[PDB]
Amino acid sequence: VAIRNFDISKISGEWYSIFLASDVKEKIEENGSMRVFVDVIRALDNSSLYAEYQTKVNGECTEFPMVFDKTEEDGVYSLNYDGYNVFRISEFENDEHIILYLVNFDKDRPFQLFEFYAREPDVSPEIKEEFVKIVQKRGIVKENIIDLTKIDRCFQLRG
Amino acid sequence: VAIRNFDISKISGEWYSIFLASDVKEKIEENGSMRVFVDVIRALDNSSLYAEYQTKVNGECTEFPMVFDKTEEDGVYSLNYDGYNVFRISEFENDEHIILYLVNFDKDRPFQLFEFYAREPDVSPEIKEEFVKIVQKRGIVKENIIDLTKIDRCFQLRG
């Protein structure tokens, strides 16, 4: 229930991607642009955030960096990747879990996307349930929630 | 069908609010923060946009300005009003109609909102139909679409 602002001095280091949820399924499905799995986040110099992601293109595991630029609103960041994106990072229940709400402002097909990150590769079933509920309040349906701990997240490449 | 980038040199002057649509109805209902009716838009100096809005608080017509700040993405603007908002302005079918897609990044209750502006106070039924369809693709339901030409938009104050 407890969704608060993340303290950015606590964010750096290794994370895992737990769920992806979106009202445009194709973005988080096999070969979608947002089917990506976090590895590490680092705080850069001007308040920008750096992250490395694994992803599978055509069945092979790859990796690439992203950078997130701080907006004037706290906990809110913009990101140039498959167009322009704005999202908020929040702490979910405690500082070991991050809930992420993003929108991509594509002219023709914008969409909303949730990411859920944890310091552990898998989470308790209670956390999962609270996550689905939250996404369902945003109006996304359960079919569109993809549980990532049940697939290949390219762990061979982490580090 | 034709949804393109608005040419900002064509934007200034008088507009009218035609519809409001949102997945959080209360924002566009009587006394909601987003139940607002455009009057005029002006282009400012640094690419910022200025607009004046009428609104009814507790049954009396009022007015106040808003300013929209240009992001790096074209057609996309941020706005500090009832928290932090990001939206895209597009031309709808022709330069006399603007379709507006906004998100408010409130931590606890974010929402999506569409505004529809025209150079005329009312529009053809074809335009209306295309508008509802577009909103329904975004996953908002018809009950949440409020047709503004059927209420009081405080015209006494325009000018």
Side-chain angles (χ1 to χ4, degrees), chain B residues 6-24:
Chain B
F6 200 84
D7 161 13
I8 295 290
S9 72
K10 258 156 46 169
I11 202 145
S12 95
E14 272 197 60
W15 290 83
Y16 299 92
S17 294
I18 314 298
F19 310 97
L20 288 166
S22 164
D23 43 28
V24 177

Side-chain angles (χ1 to χ4, degrees), chain B residues 7-108 110-144:
Chain B
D7 161 13
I8 295 290
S9 72
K10 258 156 46 169
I11 202 145
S12 95
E14 272 197 60
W15 290 83
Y16 299 92
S17 294
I18 314 298
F19 310 97
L20 288 166
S22 164
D23 43 28
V24 177
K25 257 294 262 235
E26 187 183 301
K27 287 297 175 184
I28 49 170
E29 273 172 345
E30 219 40 289
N31 301 310
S33 69
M34 304 282 180
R35 200 184 189 82
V36 294
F37 326 112
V38 236
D39 184 353
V40 62
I41 299 173
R42 322 175 277 119
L44 304 163
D45 236 343
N46 62 154
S47 85
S48 280
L49 284 178
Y50 174 79
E52 276 171 16
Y53 286 88
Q54 285 68 55
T55 192
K56 235 132 128 141
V57 198
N58 287 138
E60 269 169 46
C61 283
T62 18
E63 54 175 1
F64 68 95
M66 278 198 208
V67 168
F68 312 137
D69 302 317
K70 216 200 197 291
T71 63
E72 174 249 336
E73 175 68 14
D74 272 14
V76 175
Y77 293 85
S78 47
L79 155 73
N80 287 287
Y81 168 69
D82 188 18
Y84 186 73
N85 305 277
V86 168
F87 56 96
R88 173 182 296 273
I89 300 164
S90 325
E91 125 157 20
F92 184 100
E93 194 56 64
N94 61 58
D95 67 10
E96 283 175 331
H97 310 73
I98 290 161
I99 186 155
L100 281 225
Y101 176 61
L102 176 161
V103 173
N104 181 290
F105 289 86
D106 178 70
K107 169 168 76 66
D108 298 286
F111 55 87
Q112 316 167 86
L113 165 102
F114 292 77
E115 295 171 273
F116 191 83
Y117 298 165
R119 292 293 197 177
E120 308 263 71
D122 198 354
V123 298
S124 56
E126 290 92 72
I127 292 305
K128 326 216 184 188
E129 282 322 77
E130 206 27 73
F131 174 83
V132 34
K133 125 179 227 206
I134 285 149
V135 163
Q136 287 185 115
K137 125 112 108 326
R138 183 84 302 278
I140 286 162
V141 68
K142 284 222 219 305
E143 317 60 16
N144 292 216

Side-chain angles (χ1 to χ4, degrees), chain A residues 12-108 110-126:
Chain A
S12 95
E14 272 197 60
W15 290 83
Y16 299 92
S17 294
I18 314 298
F19 310 97
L20 288 166
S22 164
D23 43 28
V24 177
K25 257 294 262 235
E26 187 183 301
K27 287 297 175 184
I28 49 170
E29 273 172 345
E30 219 40 289
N31 301 310
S33 69
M34 304 282 180
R35 200 184 189 82
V36 294
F37 326 112
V38 236
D39 184 353
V40 62
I41 299 173
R42 322 175 277 119
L44 304 163
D45 236 343
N46 62 154
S47 85
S48 280
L49 284 178
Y50 174 79
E52 276 171 16
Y53 286 88
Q54 285 68 55
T55 192
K56 235 132 128 141
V57 198
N58 287 138
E60 269 169 46
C61 283
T62 18
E63 54 175 1
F64 68 95
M66 278 198 208
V67 168
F68 312 137
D69 302 317
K70 216 200 197 291
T71 63
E72 174 249 336
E73 175 68 14
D74 272 14
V76 175
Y77 293 85
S78 47
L79 155 73
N80 287 287
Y81 168 69
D82 188 18
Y84 186 73
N85 305 277
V86 168
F87 56 96
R88 173 182 296 273
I89 300 164
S90 325
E91 125 157 20
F92 184 100
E93 194 56 64
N94 61 58
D95 67 10
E96 283 175 331
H97 310 73
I98 290 161
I99 186 155
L100 281 225
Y101 176 61
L102 176 161
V103 173
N104 181 290
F105 289 86
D106 178 70
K107 169 168 76 66
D108 298 286
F111 55 87
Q112 316 167 86
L113 165 102
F114 292 77
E115 295 171 273
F116 191 83
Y117 298 165
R119 292 293 197 177
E120 308 263 71
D122 198 354
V123 298
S124 56
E126 290 92 72

Side-chain angles (χ1 to χ4, degrees), chain A residues 1-4 91-94 126-127 130-131 133-134, chain B residues 107-108:
Chain A
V1 217
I3 282 170
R4 328 199 169 217
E91 125 157 20
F92 184 100
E93 194 56 64
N94 61 58
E126 290 92 72
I127 292 305
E130 206 27 73
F131 174 83
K133 125 179 227 206
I134 285 149
Chain B
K107 169 168 76 66
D108 298 286

